[PDB]
Amino acid sequence: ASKKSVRWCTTSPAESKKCAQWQRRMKKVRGPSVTCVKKTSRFECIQAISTEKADAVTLDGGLVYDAGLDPYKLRPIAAEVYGTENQPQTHYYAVAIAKKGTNFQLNQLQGLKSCHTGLGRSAGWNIPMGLLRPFLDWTGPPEPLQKAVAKFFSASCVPCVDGKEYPNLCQLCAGTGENKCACSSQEPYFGYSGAFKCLQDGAGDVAFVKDSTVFESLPAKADRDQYELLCPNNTRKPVDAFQECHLARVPSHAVVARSVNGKEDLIWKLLVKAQEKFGRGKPSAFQLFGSPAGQKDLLFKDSALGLLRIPKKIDSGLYLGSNYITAIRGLRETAAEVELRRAQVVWCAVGSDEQLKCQEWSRQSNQSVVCATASTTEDCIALVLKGEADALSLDGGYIYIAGKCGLVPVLAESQQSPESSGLDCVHRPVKGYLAVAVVRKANDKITWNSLRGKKSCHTAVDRTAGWNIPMGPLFKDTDSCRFDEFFSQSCAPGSDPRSKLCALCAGNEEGQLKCVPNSSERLYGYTGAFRCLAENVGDVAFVKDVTVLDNTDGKGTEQWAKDLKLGDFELLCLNGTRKPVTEAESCHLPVAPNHAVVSRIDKVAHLRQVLLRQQAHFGRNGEDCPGKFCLFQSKTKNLLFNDNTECLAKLQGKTTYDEYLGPQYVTAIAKLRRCSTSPLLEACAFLMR
Numbered sequence: 001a002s003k004k005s006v007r008w009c010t011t012s013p014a015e016s017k018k019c020a021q022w023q024r025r026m027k028k029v030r031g032p033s034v035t036c037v038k039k040t041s042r043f044e045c046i047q048a049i050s051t052e053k054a055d056a057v058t059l060d061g062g063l064v065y066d067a068g069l070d071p072y073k074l075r076p077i078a079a080e081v082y083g084t085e086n087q088p089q090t091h092y093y094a095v096a097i098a099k100k101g102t103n104f105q106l107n108q109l110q111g112l113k114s115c116h117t118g119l120g121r122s123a124g125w126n127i128p129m130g131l132l133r134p135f136l137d138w139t140g141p142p143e144p145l146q147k148a149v150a151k152f153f154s155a156s157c158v159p160c161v162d163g164k165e166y167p168n169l170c171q172l173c174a175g176t177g178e179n180k181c182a183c184s185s186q187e188p189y190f191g192y193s194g195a196f197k198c199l200q201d202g203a204g205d206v207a208f209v210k211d212s213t214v215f216e217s218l219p220a221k222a223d224r225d226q227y228e229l230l231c232p233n234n235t236r237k238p239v240d241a242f243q244e245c246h247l248a249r250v251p252s253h254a255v256v257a258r259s260v261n262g263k264e265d266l267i268w269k270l271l272v273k274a275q276e277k278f279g280r281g282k283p284s285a286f287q288l289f290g291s292p293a294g295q296k297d298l299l300f301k302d303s304a305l306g307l308l309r310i311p312k313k314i315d316s317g318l319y320l321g322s323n324y325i326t327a328i329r330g331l332r333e334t335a336a337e338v339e340l341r342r343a344q345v346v347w348c349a350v351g352s353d354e355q356l357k358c359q360e361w362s363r364q365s366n367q368s369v370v371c372a373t374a375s376t377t378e379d380c381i382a383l384v385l386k387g388e389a390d391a392l393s394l395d396g397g398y399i400y401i402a403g404k405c406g407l408v409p410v411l412a413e414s415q416q417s418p419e420s421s422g423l424d425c426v427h428r429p430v431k432g433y434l435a436v437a438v439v440r441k442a443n444d445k446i447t448w449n450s451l452r453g454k455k456s457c458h459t460a461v462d463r464t465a466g467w468n469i470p471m472g473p474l475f476k477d478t479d480s481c482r483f484d485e486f487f488s489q490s491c492a493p494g495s496d497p498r499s500k501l502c503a504l505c506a507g508n509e510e511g512q513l514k515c516v517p518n519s520s521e522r523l524y525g526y527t528g529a530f531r532c533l534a535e536n537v538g539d540v541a542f543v544k545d546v547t548v549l550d551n552t553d554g555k556g557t558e559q560w561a562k563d564l565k566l567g568d569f570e571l572l573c574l575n576g577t578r579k580p581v582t583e584a585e586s587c588h589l590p591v592a593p594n595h596a597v598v599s600r601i602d603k604v605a606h607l608r609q610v611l612l613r614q615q616a617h618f619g620r621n622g623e624d625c626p627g628k629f630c631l632f633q634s635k636t637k638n639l640l641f642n643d644n645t646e647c648l649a650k651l652q653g654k655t656t657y658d659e660y661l662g663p664q665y666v667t668a669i670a671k672l673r674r675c676s677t678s679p680l681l682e683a684c685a686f687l688m689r
Contacts, residue, residue, distance in 0.1 A: 007037050007053075010299070022274075064251075068315060077309075081305055090252045094210055128208045128327075130326065156204065172189070195209050214239045251320065308689070313679045322384075329341075347361075347372070348391070349372070381407070381598075390599055397468070399657055400673070404657075409657060410597040410598060412430075413595040413648060436465075447576060455489055459528075488500065490538070493516060545584040545588060549581050553565060566581055590662050591662055615648055
């Protein structure tokens with residue numbers, strides 16, 4: 001029955017027959033135990049695996065999606081690999097090409113001519129018609145999508161579609177006689193290359209193919225320049241920019257297993273060894289990837305050439321991706337459900353209090369804003385990645401992580417600048433404080449190159465300009481994460497009390513907790529970091545440019561911050577040189593960043609207008625904030641937003657995270673980030689295999 005073995009699920013006697021020898025050639029090389037379970041559809045299999053009847057089965061994207069839904073909750077354990085020894089691939093991008101010159105965008109396709117790889121195919125039919133659902137005027141499932149499309153496009157070529165039922169969908173095809181619109185290579189414009197030729201010849205204005213088609217059809221760059229890609233943000237971009245400009249991403253078929261009591265490891269071990277003996281390119285008379293003459297793709301894809309272990313963090317939604325899931329949703333929901341989702345905004349509250357404030361703003365919003373809630377900030381990003389969440393305001397460290405996972409900044413949290421300010425904050429962009437390295441002019445043997453082994457003064461451990469920024473481009477070159485083996489002695493609150501990072505710190509008026517991460521530690525914060533330097537302790541201090549000229553000119557604190565000028569201190573430029581705190585715009589590390597609202601490039605447009613409205617009513621000058629719930633007033637604890645940001649300000653050029661955080665900041669963080677891993681980060685790095 002349920003021996004110490006993986007029970008694979010079969011959906012046809014043939015498939016069931018390959019699993020027969022599959023099991024036996026196994027005991028012969030003492031690889032793991034594999035018993036088969038005869039079923040009659042992957043779907044039956046999904047039910048089996050979920051009720052311990054079986055343990056594994058390999059499914060395709062659409063089924064991986066239904067397998068992961070709330071009743072079964074299976075998850076992808078392994079991905080098939082395609083391509084070849086030199087170029088292995090685990091996924092590709094569905095794209096939309098069109099001749100350069102024409103100027104329609106993705107949202108302006110009504111009435112044009114279309115070329116499709118084939119009815120039912122993924123890149124040529126389901127993904128682009130699922131996404132363009134909002135423009136179809138189609139009831140839903142019962143009505144033939146094919147009639148909705150016949151009315152959307154003037155004419156097209158869709159192989160496999162019914163000629164005398166929907167003539168204009170076969171109008172542009174080129175097969176002759178009884179082969180026009182055929183569902184095979186008999187129809188010239190069939191498949192990827194075919195749908196593409198259909199664009200080249202001029203029969204259509206758009207072709208729905210995948211990332212590589214142009215490159216396989218036009219080896220000459222000169223030729224390829226004549227083409228453009230229609231991006232999901234209604235913009236056009238060159239053909240080798242499919243990475244940042246595609247409709248969707250379709251992952252390789254996957255082996256699924258249950259979440260709870262999945263038997264994963266045992267399942268992978270069986271796969272690891274079987275790949276080793278009967279894999280691709282092995283002597284074996286029986287091969288995992290390959291089927292007899294008639295049958296095809298038994299258990300696995302004949303074309304497959306291996307399996308990759310999928311990181312545990314990834315579930316069915318992360319594996320599929322938001323664009324893919326939306327395309328699926330768009331092909332099975334009602335014009336109602338689709339419109340509701342497209343219109344409302346789901347915020348991802350983090351924590352209980354933040355969930356509460358969100359529910360509240362939900363009421364006052366009249367449902368314009370709705371709430372999803374996670375435990376960590378990372379899970380919130382994951383929810384927005386799989387389309388279950390729409391937005392979330394993040395700090396720079398995470399804006400980056402979301403930037404590496406395909407997310408883009410929507411609105412920035414402009415700083416209120418504390419004690420009063422001025423209106424028109426939606427267009428007046430705050431620059432964010434400049435991180436800098438201040439040094440005493442009474443010190444000539446200490447310049448930003450020659451810092452190794454000097455006395456350093458830090459605000460605190462893991463603080464934007466007090467640590468993360470300097471230690472970043474001051475450790476990028478090397479590949480060690482020993483930030484303690486640099487700087488003889490440093491004061492960095494948040495470090496081991498007895499290490500060299502907590503040697504020069506002060507204490508609680510001397511006597512109590514030393515180096516402790518707070519005001520309870522004299523030389524702490526942009527205040528103590530400047531004190532640590534002012535009082536000849538450290539050769540350098542890392543704080544904000546404003547810390548110097550905002551604590552000097554006999555304007556500081558106690559006895560130390562008196563009688564000390566500004567032209568008395570100095571900055572530390574990456575350019576090796578060094579001038580006064582005045583020219584800090586032309587001599588500084590990077591710019592600390594402001595928190596920003598992050599989301600999917602598809603949701604940006606609609607998200608921006610909804611947030612500016614929420615601001616007009618609940619904003620700092622909102623015609624309803626004092627009167628009824630204030631956006632920027634958290635239960636004093638920075639919920640959903642920072643309690644002292646004036647308004648959400650429009651990004652003015654900066655539209656990516658690279659543009660936003662800045663080249664210098666991305667560099668410091670990057671180095672830093674690869675020292676302290678982010679399971680979600682490696683999850684995203686994997687999805688780009």
